[PDB]
Amino acid sequence: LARKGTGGRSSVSGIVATVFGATGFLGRYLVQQLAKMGSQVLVPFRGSEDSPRHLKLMGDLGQVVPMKFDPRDEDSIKAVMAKANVVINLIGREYETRNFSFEDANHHIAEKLALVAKEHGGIMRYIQVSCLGASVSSPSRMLRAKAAAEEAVLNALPEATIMRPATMIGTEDRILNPWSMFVKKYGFLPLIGGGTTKFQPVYVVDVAAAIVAALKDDGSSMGKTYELGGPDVFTTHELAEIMYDMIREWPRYVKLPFPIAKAMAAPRDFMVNKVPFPLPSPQIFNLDQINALTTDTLVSDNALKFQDLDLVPHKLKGYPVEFLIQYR
Amino acid sequence: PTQILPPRNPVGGARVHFSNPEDAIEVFVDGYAVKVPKGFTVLQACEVAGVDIPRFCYHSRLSIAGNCRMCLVEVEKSPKPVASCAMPALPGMKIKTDTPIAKKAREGVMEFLLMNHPLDCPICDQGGECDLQDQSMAFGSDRGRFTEMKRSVVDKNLGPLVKTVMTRCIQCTRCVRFASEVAGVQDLGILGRGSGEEIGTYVEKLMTSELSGNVIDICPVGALTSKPFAFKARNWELKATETIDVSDAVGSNIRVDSRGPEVMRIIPRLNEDINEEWISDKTRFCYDGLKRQRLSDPMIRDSDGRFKAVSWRDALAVVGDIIHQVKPDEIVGVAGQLSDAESMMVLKDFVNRMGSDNVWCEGTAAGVDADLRYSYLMNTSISGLENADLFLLIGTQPRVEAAMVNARICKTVRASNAKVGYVGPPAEFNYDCKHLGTGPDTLKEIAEGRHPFCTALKNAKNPAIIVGAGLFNRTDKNAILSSVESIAQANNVVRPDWNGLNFLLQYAAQAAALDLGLIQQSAKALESAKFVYLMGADDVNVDKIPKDAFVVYQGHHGDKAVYRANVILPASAFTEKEGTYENTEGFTQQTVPAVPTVGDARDDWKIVRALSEVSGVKLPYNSIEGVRSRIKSVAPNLVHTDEREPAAFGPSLKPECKEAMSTTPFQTVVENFYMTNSITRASKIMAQCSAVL
Amino acid sequence: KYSWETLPKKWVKKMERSEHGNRFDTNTDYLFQLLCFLKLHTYTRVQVLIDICGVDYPSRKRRFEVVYNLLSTRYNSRIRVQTSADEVTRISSVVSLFPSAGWWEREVWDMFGVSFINHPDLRRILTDYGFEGHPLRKDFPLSGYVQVRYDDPEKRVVSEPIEMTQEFRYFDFASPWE
Amino acid sequence: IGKVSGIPEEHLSRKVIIYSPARTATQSGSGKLGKWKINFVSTLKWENPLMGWTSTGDPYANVGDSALAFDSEEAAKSFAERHGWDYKVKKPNTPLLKVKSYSDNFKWKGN
Amino acid sequence: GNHTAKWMQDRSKKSPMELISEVPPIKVDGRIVACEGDTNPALGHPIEFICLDLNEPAICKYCGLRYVQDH
Amino acid sequence: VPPNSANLTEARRRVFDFFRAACRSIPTIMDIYNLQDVVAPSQLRYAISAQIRNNAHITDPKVIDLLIFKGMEELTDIVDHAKQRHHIIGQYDFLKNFYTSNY
Amino acid sequence: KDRYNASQVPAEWHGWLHFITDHTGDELLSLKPKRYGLEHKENFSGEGDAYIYHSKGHTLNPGQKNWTRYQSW
Amino acid sequence: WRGSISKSMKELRILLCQSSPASAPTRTFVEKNYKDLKSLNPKLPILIRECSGVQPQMWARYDMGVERCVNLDGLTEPQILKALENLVKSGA
Ligand SMILES: NC(=O)C1=CN([C@@H]2O[C@H](COP(=O)(O)OP(=O)(O)OC[C@H]3O[C@@H](n4cnc5c(N)ncnc54)[C@H](OP(=O)(O)O)[C@@H]3O)[C@@H](O)[C@H]2O)C=CC1
Ligand code: SF4
Ligand code: SF4
Ligand code: FES
Ligand SMILES: [Zn+2]
């Protein structure tokens, strides 16, 4: 955009972004890309002010302005998107919480940010982030919601990019860090469904590099739902094989039939019932993540891949997984 | 005992000009002999000895004065400290610049100057760059005994350029001499006597003269300061680049004093061969342009009529497509008056390989003769005009266009009593002008020796005949130039050692253009032409271009060409780039980039070469040094920078002549001089200088 | 001064001063030999290498000037033996005579780049570990070349990218007339 | 001596200008002349959008003017050629001490 | 004003330009005034001697105070 | 180490000495910083050789001495855990510029 | 008695209370300037925006000024 | 002396040099030939350009911007004129 600089960390890029999901595992890499290529980031946080503290750095003195906002209350989303031209949406959950349901956290928000950005005429690029294979009739209610979110962000706001990152790996992720700390149940890894799932993980740095690459691009990458798949189409068991290469442990997997898992994840699905107590965020056994685990639709079809962003993803061996060394 | 004395070279590397190596007077500056030509004041006999004598009113360009006694060196056998500025060095004179009597005299005077002087140093615009502050902090006493009521003076209104605080002014008379002599307008005066002395116009009279903004550099005190540079910066913040100027084709030297990304103040700098230490008020206060109305994003035209600030890929793509889908002979490449040599070379090499030959500078009218380089140069150097005996300014109004050429003409009318003849429109001249005639008829009257001034032009030893390129626009340009060269051959003007024939130009690019052969062959270009490619040309008549022409204005400001432009390409200014310029006398300066380009602007040559590669034509070079090698190919004059390359071919090669038009007398080529180009038109200072007329 | 009479004339090669502290601007070859003199000598007993001040004159041909200060706790006097070694001239090291010269010469090499001959453990002492460039030179910009360091997705790591900061404002205070 | 100097590669292909700063036209004093300075063009200076102040990105922003001033074109050229810069020396324009005297103000215009 | 609209975004406290343009000009006797500052010559600006030959008030550049001849 | 480089011959000899030192030290480099899986010994030898060859046109002996000293400094600070590892893995036309900036 | 912190002590007393002077705030209140005198502000550092201070480009300050010295076209 | 230059070439650039020992044959050629050449081609840009030391060349721009470079390093006046004749012939 109106870029006046050389690199970043003091440059300008005319991108005063509001990364709605910045205080999150994908958010810290995307905010660092947007604010290391020298552009403002209006990180909106939901609760504790300690959430975006790790984002006050990685941006030079107001290039990252953490702001407070209530997800269900507008006139605050409009205040966060007051001075903005890019609005990325990383607000998503893999687990239903007693207060915010799957739609009220994946679909009824993305549609709401879409509408309140449409109203705030001036949002040049609105990126919408949803999981890969999030198409309607997918088992996991998280993916059906995330599909409705795409359909409502494109309808209510055309020329709005839609990344489709598959399960993203990296430090502080929700895919590998639960498996480790469950290998700390004495090497016991419960790969569910027998590892027949075929899903294409991707180094979160490269998902961020794609989310920024659709901003730095021209008028293209508007309304075109990418699929940030990644290389080396894996299987859950095979991906676990690479963890045990980093964390020094001996592969001691077990297979779990899907009924056994869905029964093991039958608790923590009474979230709307147990009102006077919030449940502890089901990490590995998530009935909805399991419904997604069943069908191996998490593979990039002939839709737009990283190749349509002049970008090639990193592998999943070596550094893009070296966050596991802290578990040795 | 085998000592190592310092070299003792002149004060500023000052070239000492012996009129002959025989009359070298030898004087002792602090017991160190120095050989100075006959007539050197003691101050110059010390500036030859490296001794810097503190001077308040002694300017080398200006006359000599005793309005203050800050120098007072003690010569050997005089009863009183002699003012060094006026005492001519006599052979054997012993000058003691640091003897206790000299230092006490300097401290005495610097106490008197700081006695009635107000404590305005914090609020003084020239607080850091002050002769009074730097002479008090170096030669004047550390304390002042005057504790009484200083005198104070009201602030005279001297126009929208020179802010005046006469209380600070020390009445050294330097400006009242500069306006009387160099500027030659005679408006300033030392009204009154005693401490009540007040410098300025007795009646409220804006300094209507151009070239009168240099009084601030002349002024050794804050008193006279740039009102545009009201207080915006300080003498220490300003990072200085030794750039050149492009407003007028004199190509005056300059220091673009910039603070960060913007040009705070444009100040002259010594270059004895173009502008001694003076720059026109068109150059001092055009810096305000470079920050107003700048084009910062490449805007193409949508399906409505308003612009759309697309990126560079899209704008270059649309321009390339529209040149691919047009007939070749319909491409024209009008190049702006501020365009450097490189970008004009790139424009030529682009619109050439596109199958056209319709590139030309903005000012050069149809059928210019750019073959022989004397035909558009000031063959006699701008310094050479100091040796001229008689001038014949054929039109050319040199006070208006090429103001430093007129400054040299006025200096060499005052110093050596030269007499000028003027065949042009009725104008106002600093000096005695002796207007001859209004039209070309009186030019024939001189060509045929039937004029009372032809007998003057004959008898003069070294004559000069300035013919402004403003009369190339007339249809009978060959006839006028033939009569000019007839006057030359008749009065022995252009002779092997003088070459008094010289044409001045009014556009900075015009010399470099006519050097690269950027000639408008004829009309029927810019008409029946469908890819007009204005390269920063605002003064091109956009009423000539056909309505269906896809004008692509690669300017940096845009006044009227931008409104017509079907696609804009924002370029850099003259300070933001590094462009090789050629002034009228053939001197080839080279600007040095001061401030960063605004927004998403690019270099002129970069834009044209990128448009070339987008539009398919593979152009050999890809850098600034490459295109300078291409210039060396097409015109090596514009590669040997900072060196004038005289044209070794007189007018005896121009083929033949025609008849000069009786009607249509010489027309004023520059109407304003305060709005001559785009930088100057979009400025907030030049506009409002319209009151200065 | 007594020290100049006894000293071999060749050792005080280039220069010699006589105020603001006296100095023997010597040659780099005769330096540690000159430092051997003035120490372990009965009438000139310095024994104390106070300081080794690298000084960079860009306009010289021998850029640097390794100014060895020397105190004489016995005779209560201070002599400043100097040298001159450009960027690629290994100069003799006097860590063998005054063992305090170890760190001072590490600092002279770090800041400037005047490598020291047979100096054991000649390793960058002051600047950063991966520091490339020699700071206290003149041509080394104040803000450094690549010396910003910020945290990033390469967690627990501070990168070393190219530098960008509010531009250091150099003020041209220096006035004419000196 | 460019490679051993630790300067990064991208700043040894820099194009400098070895000028001699002309006299400040405002003050008629030659006490700052004859100090040749390399001029790393260093034109890229944006405005840090939080506060009004500027913000360079080139490391050689100030050292061209500040603290790096030689005393002769030969030493400055030797410096900019050791380090491998592409120096274009811009000669300093010096003044002619033309003979002038006081008694020329009171010249007689004959009649 | 417009200059004062560059540094002050409050726009409720009176702009210093108005605070000084609303103070009346000070009558005096002679043709030159002192305006050493507020009152204490050491807590004000360097003494600025102003000329009152004109009819209109001549402002003190440092303090904005205005003086008239009062003949 | 005294600059015995009174000629390019001794300097080249000690260049080969430093090259042999770095090559025979690559084992510990790969061990301490864990590159035995990302990089091959052929590739690290390739990089060291491309370094020593990138600066091979040095007709000055003392400049070669100083280059070898900087290289030994780099190595000794890579052998020991003085510098980190995420740089060691990194240590191992006109139009496309014009579109980005003006420089 | 709750929510107190330093810097709530106005300038009239912040002298007497740090022993810099011996003039109680009831004595310096005849010296506080009436024309430009401003009440204290407790140093609202962190207590929500529009109480905290903001520069003129922070994007939280109402009226975020643009510093581009060049006036675009 | 050729006449058909304005209809074949687009411009002719002769990079003689001011006062070199060499490039003097080029100056003689121009001095003796340019008057007649331009009187015969009243509109062609026959560009004469000076220098300090540039080898005396003779360039020529044809239709589509191509350029023949003929170096007159030692060619005499008739040799230079024959070179120009070859230039004119190689464009038509
Ligand atoms: N993690 C993965 O492996 C995959 C994730 N994705 C998608 O990437 C995006 C970001 O991922 P990641 O950062 O790991 O996700 P997280 O679950 O860690 O949440 C990221 C952000 O979402 C915000 N958020 C979530 N739900 C709500 C809500 N109801 N109201 C307000 N804010 C909310 C969080 O706020 P707070 O921190 O305060 O809770 C945080 O800022 C999501 O759309 C996610 O589904 C794509 C592929 C798979
Ligand atoms: S001219 Fe200005 S800065 Fe210099 S001494 Fe006088 S008041 Fe002070
Ligand atoms: S106004 Fe300036 S130049 Fe004129 S007499 Fe006063 S101090 Fe000298
Ligand atoms: S300047 Fe020479 S004495 Fe006044
Ligand atoms: Zn006052």
Side-chain angles (χ1 to χ4, degrees), chain H residues 17-85:
Chain H
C17 217
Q18 302 162 116
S19 278
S20 297
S23 76
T26 305
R27 253 173 293 136
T28 61
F29 151 73
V30 162
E31 268 278 356
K32 300 190 187 56
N33 210 329
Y34 168 81
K35 195 174 171 64
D36 313 292
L37 265 174
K38 207 205 174 206
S39 67
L40 210 50
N41 312 322
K43 302 303 295 184
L44 187 71
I46 302 185
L47 261 52
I48 321 293
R49 295 297 169 258
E50 285 88 350
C51 53
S52 306
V54 160
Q55 313 284 352
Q57 314 181 329
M58 162 167 303
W59 291 75
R61 274 189 40 239
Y62 303 128
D63 169 51
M64 209 66 69
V66 307
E67 277 194 352
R68 300 289 174 85
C69 182
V70 176
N71 297 76
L72 325 177
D73 47 59
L75 311 193
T76 70
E77 206 273 351
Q79 307 208 43
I80 292 150
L81 183 59
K82 167 58 61 182
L84 163 64
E85 154 77 15

Side-chain angles (χ1 to χ4, degrees), chain C:
Chain C
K1 177 170 49 181
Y2 161 90
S3 196
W4 183 51
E5 316 311 340
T6 67
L7 250 173
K9 291 315 170 66
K10 83 178 317 186
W11 279 358
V12 36
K13 173 75 209 309
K14 304 198 285 299
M15 303 168 200
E16 185 211 15
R17 209 170 58 169
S18 305
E19 186 39 55
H20 286 342
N22 325 316
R23 73 199 182 82
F24 293 141
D25 186 309
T26 189
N27 209 321
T28 40
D29 304 306
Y30 313 116
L31 165 74
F32 162 109
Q33 307 179 17
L34 168 40
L35 288 223
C36 216
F37 201 105
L38 285 170
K39 185 207 171 67
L40 48 103
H41 179 93
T42 275
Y43 267 108
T44 56
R45 293 223 54 83
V46 297
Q47 307 157 309
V48 190
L49 185 90
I50 294 298
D51 192 350
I52 293 194
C53 311
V55 173
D56 175 79
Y57 295 110
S59 45
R60 271 174 161 74
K61 187 158 194 68
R62 312 294 300 281
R63 288 194 54 161
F64 309 107
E65 183 204 20
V66 195
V67 188
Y68 298 69
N69 270 269
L70 303 159
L71 171 68
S72 158
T73 320
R74 176 92 163 150
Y75 295 102
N76 187 9
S77 88
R78 181 173 282 113
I79 305 161
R80 314 195 293 97
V81 177
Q82 297 174 335
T83 51
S84 308
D86 64 352
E87 318 94 306
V88 294
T89 286
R90 281 204 173 80
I91 183 181
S92 303
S93 158
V94 305
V95 61
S96 307
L97 283 154
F98 320 90
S100 82
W103 273 19
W104 294 105
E105 292 165 350
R106 281 171 73 191
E107 175 195 75
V108 166
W109 182 70
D110 185 19
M111 305 289 99
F112 292 93
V114 195
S115 314
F116 279 87
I117 295 190
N118 73 86
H119 169 112
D121 183 24
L122 184 78
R123 190 184 60 255
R124 284 183 176 284
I125 179 56
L126 281 179
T127 64
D128 182 0
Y129 287 109
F131 205 69
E132 64 179 1
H134 296 255
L136 258 54
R137 283 184 177 183
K138 278 314 193 305
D139 74 85
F140 189 89
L142 180 52
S143 285
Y145 294 118
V146 298
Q147 264 292 299
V148 294
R149 297 189 92 169
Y150 70 118
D151 192 293
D152 39 357
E154 316 185 22
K155 301 195 57 168
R156 214 179 280 241
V157 155
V158 287
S159 297
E160 324 175 20
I162 63 169
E163 74 95 11
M164 278 176 235
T165 40
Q166 173 181 355
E167 173 213 339
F168 176 88
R169 319 210 290 285
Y170 164 60
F171 291 128
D172 201 28
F173 294 136
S175 88
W177 296 289
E178 287 180 351

Side-chain angles (χ1 to χ4, degrees), chain B residues 43 53-59 64-73 82-87 109 135 172 174 177:
Chain B
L43 199 155
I53 297 177
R55 77 222 48 154
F56 269 102
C57 37
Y58 163 79
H59 202 89
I64 294 180
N67 283 73
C68 82
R69 307 281 286 203
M70 187 56 189
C71 285
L72 291 184
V73 302
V82 304
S84 78
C85 60
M87 184 71 41
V109 174
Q135 276 157 274
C172 56
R174 223 199 273 182
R177 299 196 325 261

Side-chain angles (χ1 to χ4, degrees), chain A residues 16 40-42 56 60-67 83, chain D residues 49-51, chain E residues 9, chain G residues 49 52-65 67:
Chain A
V16 182
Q40 191 142 14
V41 191
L42 307 200
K56 285 195 292 178
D60 188 2
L61 288 180
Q63 295 310 294
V64 183
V65 197
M67 302 183 69
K83 325 199 178 53
Chain D
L50 163 69
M51 307 285 292
Chain E
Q9 272 208 328
Chain G
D49 314 328
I52 203 160
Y53 190 68
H54 283 147
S55 316
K56 294 207 181 40
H58 204 172
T59 296
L60 290 192
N61 163 272
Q64 172 190 350
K65 280 187 52 61
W67 312 112

Side-chain angles (χ1 to χ4, degrees), chain A:
Chain A
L1 273 302
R3 151 202 194 276
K4 41 164 182 174
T6 180
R9 182 76 210 182
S10 53
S11 298
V12 191
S13 299
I15 286 183
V16 182
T18 66
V19 182
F20 272 91
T23 78
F25 147 65
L26 172 46
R28 303 177 23 115
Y29 300 80
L30 171 57
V31 171
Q32 200 265 2
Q33 307 286 320
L34 287 195
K36 171 207 56 170
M37 78 162 205
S39 89
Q40 191 142 14
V41 191
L42 307 200
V43 170
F45 63 96
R46 176 188 58 83
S48 192
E49 44 182 16
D50 272 30
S51 279
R53 269 172 68 246
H54 64 275
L55 305 179
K56 285 195 292 178
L57 78 164
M58 88 185 47
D60 188 2
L61 288 180
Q63 295 310 294
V64 183
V65 197
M67 302 183 69
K68 182 85 159 281
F69 90 112
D70 307 346
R72 297 154 154 167
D73 178 33
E74 311 162 20
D75 168 273
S76 157
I77 313 192
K78 281 188 189 184
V80 173
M81 285 184 329
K83 325 199 178 53
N85 48 36
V86 184
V87 173
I88 310 171
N89 166 57
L90 311 187
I91 282 184
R93 264 307 136 84
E94 62 176 10
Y95 59 83
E96 202 160 15
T97 295
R98 157 197 40 92
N99 269 168
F100 303 81
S101 72
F102 263 110
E103 302 90 21
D104 180 31
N106 294 355
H107 161 68
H108 283 304
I109 297 298
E111 174 175 11
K112 177 185 313 179
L113 318 187
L115 291 165
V116 303
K118 180 183 182 65
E119 171 267 358
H120 165 275
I123 295 316
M124 307 171 323
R125 294 180 184 89
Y126 184 112
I127 293 184
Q128 157 67 213
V129 156
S130 46
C131 313
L132 199 144
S135 289
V136 196
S137 72
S138 179
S140 46
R141 329 202 313 93
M142 41 178 304
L143 287 205
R144 285 184 284 170
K146 288 213 151 293
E150 297 177 12
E151 186 210 300
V153 75
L154 285 184
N155 291 176
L157 198 143
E159 47 92 29
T161 313
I162 290 186
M163 300 312 187
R164 268 198 168 187
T167 78
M168 299 170 308
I169 81 158
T171 306
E172 73 204 287
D173 69 344
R174 298 170 164 273
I175 309 303
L176 267 299
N177 269 15
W179 293 357
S180 294
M181 314 197 307
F182 208 90
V183 168
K184 304 313 168 185
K185 272 183 163 53
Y186 314 142
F188 186 80
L189 202 161
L191 56 94
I192 298 167
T196 176
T197 299
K198 269 169 179 47
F199 73 115
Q200 295 176 355
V202 52
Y203 184 28
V204 54
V205 169
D206 277 303
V207 173
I211 293 166
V212 57
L215 300 187
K216 291 161 54 197
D217 278 333
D218 46 37
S220 87
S221 298
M222 270 186 188
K224 280 190 270 293
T225 64
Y226 287 72
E227 307 215 9
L228 315 190
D232 271 340
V233 55
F234 274 162
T235 197
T236 317
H237 168 56
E238 172 43 38
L239 166 67
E241 287 290 330
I242 308 180
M243 156 169 44
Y244 291 105
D245 208 340
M246 310 295 315
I247 172 181
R248 308 263 172 150
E249 277 262 7
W250 189 244
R252 203 160 174 77
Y253 314 99
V254 296
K255 286 184 45 174
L256 258 59
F258 280 136
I260 297 196
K262 298 183 192 303
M264 206 169 325
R268 316 164 162 197
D269 196 28
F270 48 80
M271 301 277 204
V272 302
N273 294 347
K274 189 180 189 190
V275 163
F277 195 82
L279 278 301
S281 82
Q283 269 196 327
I284 171 66
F285 299 134
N286 209 321
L287 184 157
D288 305 309
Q289 206 277 337
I290 297 324
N291 289 351
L293 197 47
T294 72
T295 69
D296 53 48
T297 79
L298 300 204
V299 284
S300 316
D301 41 358
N302 62 27
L304 299 93
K305 190 223 169 203
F306 277 167
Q307 292 300 330
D308 311 330
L309 299 163
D310 293 330
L311 181 51
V312 283
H314 301 166
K315 290 317 177 198
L316 307 180
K317 296 181 200 50
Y319 163 58
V321 81
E322 260 188 350
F323 70 92
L324 282 171
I325 303 194
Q326 72 179 352
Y327 287 119
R328 297 181 163 187

